[PDB]
Structure 1
């Protein structure tokens, strides 16, 4: 059943199973798969460039990591400024680098703080215990529970989803 009042469900996405297997082979855990699953249908980067944001808010890669976090945590982007955000687009064509950056970012911030910045950027890092951040985290963990409960879900075409507001 759906997490705390939210609307949720599942459906089939052609080719998604093979893509899940590629993400796992690139080092993605079930948590990583859950984040990717929440962010795009096909675990890809065909969403609009930067997800229509610029600077520190721009999103890159299959997890929609933001440039603030990438430049703060990932060695690939060390020392870079907000205005250099176009450099994050390297993650759009390298799954291995995308996963490496995700892991570096999660380790840099710790996972609970990582969720806050992933959801809400600099504002989230400074106010990480909001209701909206908690709802995002709950959505990810609900998806993860579906993946964890049946290993077929790690390789099949099923996408689990939870409705969260776009911000």
Structure 2
């Protein structure tokens, strides 16, 4: 486990089939790690926008925020913060979700992407915080578990890390 955190793994029914769908939609192991951290079932069943509005609203299985989406992704080009409900298109289309993730990561580079993903504009402007570093470490710990045994790319196991610890 990273730092002083608890971590572990448990079984989620149907998750292996879902992992395969994410991969077939273009998700890499890093993308799977992010998805695995963000929701239990790699879905969009969390509250709409993750109970946030505007630039802070989250959409899709990676919980991408509207600032990131409208700043980097062609389908949201030129849109303002108040148009955030348009990001809900990612809740219905896994292919668009992955496409947007890749556009955003390429636009910012991965290091900046982690910062903006975690903390929005504040994160992009101050990307080297301890909290952002903890988030990144959690994702890469999950990825290490996926990398260490390829069965984890298609089985029902969810790896988890308590990011606040």
Task: Give me the whole-angstrom Cα distance separating, in 1, the residues matched to 2:143 and 2:98.
Answer: 17
1:133 — aligned with what?
Answer: 132
Displacement after TM superposition at 1:117 (Å) = 0.3
The count of aligned residue pairs is: 165
Rounded to whole Å, the distance in 2 between the matches of 1:146 and 1:119 is: 22
Cα offsets for 1:19-74 (capped at 9, x unmatched): 00000000000000000000000000000000000000000000000000000000
Q: Deviations over 1:60-89 (max 9, x none)?
A: 000000000000000010000000000000
CA distance in 1, matches of 2:3, 2:136: 12
Secondary structure in 1 matching 2:79: coil
Gaps (5+ residues) in structure 2? none
1:3, 1:143 → 2: CA distance?
10
Distance 1:41 1:87 in 2: 24
State the TM-score, normalized to the length of structure 1: 0.98
CA distance in 1: counterparts of 2:163 and 2:81, whole angstroms: 27
Structure 1 runs of 4+ with >3 Å offset = none
What value does the CA root-mean-square deviation take over the aligned residues? 1.0
* Structure 1: gaps of 5 or more residues: none
